[PDB]
Each structure stands twice: as C-alpha cells, then as structure tokens.
Amino acid sequence: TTVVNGVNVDQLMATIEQIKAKPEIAQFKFRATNQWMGGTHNQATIKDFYGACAEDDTRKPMVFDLDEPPVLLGENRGANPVEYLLVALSGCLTTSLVAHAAARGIALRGVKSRYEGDIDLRGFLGLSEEVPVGYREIRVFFSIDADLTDGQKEELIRMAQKYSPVYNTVAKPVPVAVLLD
Amino acid sequence: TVVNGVNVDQLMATIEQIKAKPEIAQFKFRATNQWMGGTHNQATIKDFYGACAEDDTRKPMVFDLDEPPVLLGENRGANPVEYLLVALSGCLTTSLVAHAAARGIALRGVKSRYEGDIDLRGFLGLSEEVPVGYREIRVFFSIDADLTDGQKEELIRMAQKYSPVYNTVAKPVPVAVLLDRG
Ligand code: NA
Numbered sequence: 001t002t003v004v005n006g007v008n009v010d011q012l013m014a015t016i017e018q019i020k021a022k023p024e025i026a027q028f029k030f031r032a033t034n035q036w037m038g039g040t041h042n043q044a045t046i047k048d049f050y051g052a053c054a055e056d057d058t059r060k061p062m063v064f065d066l067d068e069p070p071v072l073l074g075e076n077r078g079a080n081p082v083e084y085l086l087v088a089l090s091g092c093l094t095t096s097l098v099a100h101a102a103a104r105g106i107a108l109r110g111v112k113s114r115y116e117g118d119i120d121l122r123g124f125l126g127l128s129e130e131v132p133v134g135y136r137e138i139r140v141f142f143s144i145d146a147d148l149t150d151g152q153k154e155e156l157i158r159m160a161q162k163y164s165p166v167y168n169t170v171a172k173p174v175p176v177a178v179l180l181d
Numbered sequence: 182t183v184v185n186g187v188n189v190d191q192l193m194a195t196i197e198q199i200k201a202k203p204e205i206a207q208f209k210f211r212a213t214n215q216w217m218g219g220t221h222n223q224a225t226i227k228d229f230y231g232a233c234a235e236d237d238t239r240k241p242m243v244f245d246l247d248e249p250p251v252l253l254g255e256n257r258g259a260n261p262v263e264y265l266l267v268a269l270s271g272c273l274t275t276s277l278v279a280h281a282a283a284r285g286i287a288l289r290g291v292k293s294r295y296e297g298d299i300d301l302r303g304f305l306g307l308s309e310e311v312p313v314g315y316r317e318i319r320v321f322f323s324i325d326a327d328l329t330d331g332q333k334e335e336l337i338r339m340a341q342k343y344s345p346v347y348n349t350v351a352k353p354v355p356v357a358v359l360l361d362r363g
Contacts, residue, residue, distance in 0.1 A: 005218075005219065006218035006219030006220075006221070007219050007220065007253055008253060011253060012253060015251075015253075015305075016305055016307070019301065019302060019305065019307060020307065023302065026300050026301035026302045026305070026307075027298065027299075027300055027301075028298065028299045028300075028301060029296055029297065029298045029299075030260070030262050030263050030266060030296070030297055030298075030299065031263075031266070031294070031295060031296045032263065032266035032267055032270050032294070032295040033270075033292070033293070033294045033295070034270035034271065034274055034292060034293045034294075034295070035291075035292045036274050036278060036288075036290065036291035036292065038185075038186040039185065039186030039187055039278070040186075040187070040275050040278070040279070041186075042270070042271055042274040042275065042291075044266070044267040044270045044271060046259045046263045046266075046267065049249065049263075051251060051252075051301075052251050056249065056251070058249075059249065059256055060256075062258070062259040062263075064267050066267070066268075066270075066271030066274075066275070068275070069229070069231075069236065069239070071195075071231060071232050071236070072231075073187055073188060073191060073192065073279070076239055078242070079226045079242050079244075080210070080271070081268045081269070081270075081271035081272035081275065081345070081346050082210050082268070082272065082345050082346060082349075083210050083212065083226045083229075084264060084267050084268035084271060084346075085265065085268040085269075085272075085346050085349060086210060086211070086212035086224070086226075087212055087214075087224040087226065087244050087246070087264050087268075088246075088261045088262070088264035088265040088267070088268055089212075089261075089356070090212050090213075090214035090222070090224045090246075090261075091214065091222055091224060091244075091246030091260070091261035091264060092261035092262065092265075093358065094214055094216050094222040094246075095220045095222065095246070095248070095261060096304065098216060098219070098220070098222075099220065099253065108216075110216065111215075111216035111222075112213070112214060112215045112216065113213070113214045113361075114211070114212070114213050114214075114361070115211060115212040115213070115214070116209055116210070116211045117209065117210055117211075118207070118208075118209055119207075119208050119209075119210065119345055120206050120207055120208075121199070121206040121207075121208060121231075122199060122203065122206045123343070123345065123348075124276070124343050124344075124345060125195075125196055125199065125206070125343075126342075126343060127196065127199060127200065127203075127206070128203075132348065132352075132354075133342070133343060133344065133345055133347075133348040134345045134346070134347070134348030134349035134350075134352060134354055135345065135349050135354050136354075137354065137355045137356065137357070138354065138355075138356045138357075139356075139357050139359075140356065140357065140358040140359070141358075141359050141360070141361035141362075141363075142358065142359070142360060142361060143360075143361045144360070150360060153360050154360050157358055157359070157360060160358070161356075161358050162313070163303070163304050163305075163306060163313060164304075164313065165261070165262050165299055165303070165304060165313055165314045165315065166261050166262060166264075166265050166314070167313075167314075167356060167358075168303075168312065168313040168314035169262075169265060169314035169315050169350055170314075170349055170350070170354050170356055171353055171354060171355065171356050172312075172314060172353050173351060173352055173353050174312075174314055174315050174316075174317065174318065174350050174351065175317045175318070175351065176269070176317070176318045176319075176320065176341075176347060176350050176351050177317065177318070177319045177320065178273065178320040178321075178322065178337055178340070178341050178347070179319070179320065179321050179322070179337075180321070180322055180323075180324070180330060180333050180334050180337055181294075181321040181322060181323045
C-alpha cells in the first residue's frame with residue numbers, strides 16, 4: 001500500500017506536499033557535457049544535476065557515444081542523435097504513464113511501446129526550404145497489460161502525454177540558446 | 182578529401198544524388214521500449230529506413246532510463262530529460278562539424294556544455310500554467326580552431342539552423358500516441 005508499479009507512492013506524496021509548501025523545491029536543472037571525437041562521432045556525459053534547492057553530484061558519470069550509420073557518414077560507433085531523441089521520448093512517456101497510474105492506485109503488469117519518426121535530410125543539407133529540418137512527426141504506440149478496459153488504457157496514455165516533459169518539449173516550441181564560450 | 186573526419190566526397194555525392202532523386206533523402210528512425218519496473222525502462226535502437234531501403238544490419242543498442250532518488254528512481258540509468266540533452270548535444274556537434282567540413286574549415290577540437298531548467302509542478306499536475314517541458318535550454322560551445330569569435334559564431338549559427346534535434350526542440354513537432362492495435 002506504499003508501492004504501486006514499483007513507484008514509492010509515499011515518497012511521491014511527501015514530495016507533492018513539500019512542493020505545495022515550498023514551490024522552489026520543484027525547480028530542477030539538468031546538464032550534459034559533450035566532446036567531439038572526430039567526424040560524426042562525439043561523446044556526451046551526464047553527471048550532476050540541481051534540484052530541491054541543492055546541487056547533486058552524487059552519481060557515477062554516465063557516458064554515451066553518438067555517431068551515424070555509413071550512409072550518414074559515420075561508422076555506427078553509437079546510435080545517432082535523432083535516435084537518442086526517440087530514446088528520451090520513450091523513457092519519458094513510459095515513466096509518466098507508470099507514475100501517473102501509480103498515483104491513482106492503478107496496477108500495471110507490463111508496458112511496452114514503439115516509435116517511428118520521419119526526417120527528410122534535405123533539411124539538414126539545406127537543399128529544400130520547404131522540408132522541415134527536424135522530425136516532420138513522430139508516431140508512438142503503447143501496449144499495456146493490465147486489468148483495464150481499452151478506454152481506461154487510452155486515458156492513461158493521454159495522461160502520460162499531458163505530463164511528460166520530453167513529450168511537451170517535442171510537441172511545443174522550447175527555446176534553445178546556443179552561444180560561443 | 183576529408184575535412185574534420187568527414188568524407189566530403191561522399192557528402193557532395195550524396196547531395197547530387199538527392200537533387201536528382203529527392204526521395205533518397207527520406208529516412209525513418211525507430212525505437213522500442215520495455216518498462217522494467219518503477220521509473221526504470223529500457224529503450225532499444227536497431228533498424229532504420231533511408232536512401233530508399235530498409236537497413237536492419239546493425240546490432241541492437243540498449244539504453245537504461247531511470248531517475249535519481251529525489252525523482253523516485255534508484256540510479257538505474259540517466260533520466261529521460263538528460264537523454265534529451267544527450268541527443269541535442271550530439272546533433273548540434275555533428276551539424277557544426279559537418280557544415281564546417283563542407284566549407285573546408287578545419288577544426289582542432291569541439292566541446293560543449295548544456296543546461297535546461299524544468300519545474301516539476303508541471304509533471305506533477307500542480308499547476309496548469311507551468312510548462313511541463315523544459316522552460317529553456319542553454320548551450321555553450323568551445324571551438325579550438327584558427328578562427329575569430331565571429332567566424333566561430335557563424336559555425337554555431339549554421340549548426341543550429343541545420344540540426345534536426347535543435348529544430349525538433351525549438352519548434353512544435355506533432356507526436357501522435359496511441360494504444361497499439363497490433
Ligand atoms: Na519542440
């Protein structure tokens with residue numbers, strides 16, 4: 001009665017009450033660093049973050065290699081950056097779905113999902129002023145194993161989207177300032 | 182003829198082929214994800230489509246996503262909003278380097294740092310006005326090259342202009358999420 005879907009709902013409840021009292025606690029900052037490794041290969045590191053009124057440098061660094069397939073001028077030294085964007089979207093939607101279900105006391109047995117997005121490289125290459133540079137659209141499907149109706153499953157999915165930071169960062173315009181140091 | 186480790190001959194060849202046959206430039210990228218309990222889930226990258234053919238030749242790449250303790254996880258992986266920064270960082274870096282290469286501009290080194298801020302009240306449903314996503318993301322590039330600040334700033338402008346992940350963040354991209362019928 002303290003844990004649903006492997007989420008500690010007591011901790012969730014305490015976090016919500018803490019934020020209601022002191023909204024400043026809810027301000028988080030996430031960070032990365034990246035070093036170019038030649039050609040299409042580069043390496044990103046995740047380490048510290050800020051939140052709940054303090055810097056947190058407690059985690060072992062998490063290192064990621066990004067590259068391209070040969071047709072996009074790389075050697076598959078890692079997944080490509082637009083693939084990493086789908087990874088991020090998939091983790092966020094899944095967590096948002098599961099955590100919102102947990103908060104409602106809705107048990108789920110299994111969750112999986114699939115993702116496909118369309119990109120026309122004429123954008124990246126500056127060959128057409130029509131074509132978007134980014135994803136034109138992304139299509140996601142979820143499968144949920146639970147004692148729920150299809151309508152109730154669809155509701156969980158709508159709530160997942162509504163509360164997902166990565167979903168909303170994709171679907172809405174978010175400003176990105178890129179500067180010389 | 183290689184600049185910044187980029188095969189510029191292949192690049193120009195690809196461009197000419199696309200001008201003749203624009204459909205070559207249509208790619209589809211994919212992922213699958215399985216929930217692993219709590220805030221932990223796992224994404225897999227394998228196949229893609231592009232240049233008028235399916236490519237299922239790559240070995241799968243698997244990524245673990247989780248949360249720190251204060252965000253209800255157990256450090257079973259970096260969190261999804263961190264992976265978004267990872268994506269952005271790779272894309273801006275490759276776009277910068279590749280566009281420099283196409284112009285014959287050699288770079289000794291490139292590095293960058295990223296921060297975005299988020300108010301959890303969005304995710305937690307505690308405010309209807311608060312953005313659920315990032316409020317803003319800020320990126321700083323350091324470029325080691327035989328270039329003035331203004332020349333570096335031009336490479337950075339072009340990086341952003343032509344970066345798919347930058348434009349996916351900066352612009353509204355439609356995303357349809359549905360219950361699977363297969
Ligand atoms: Na966006």
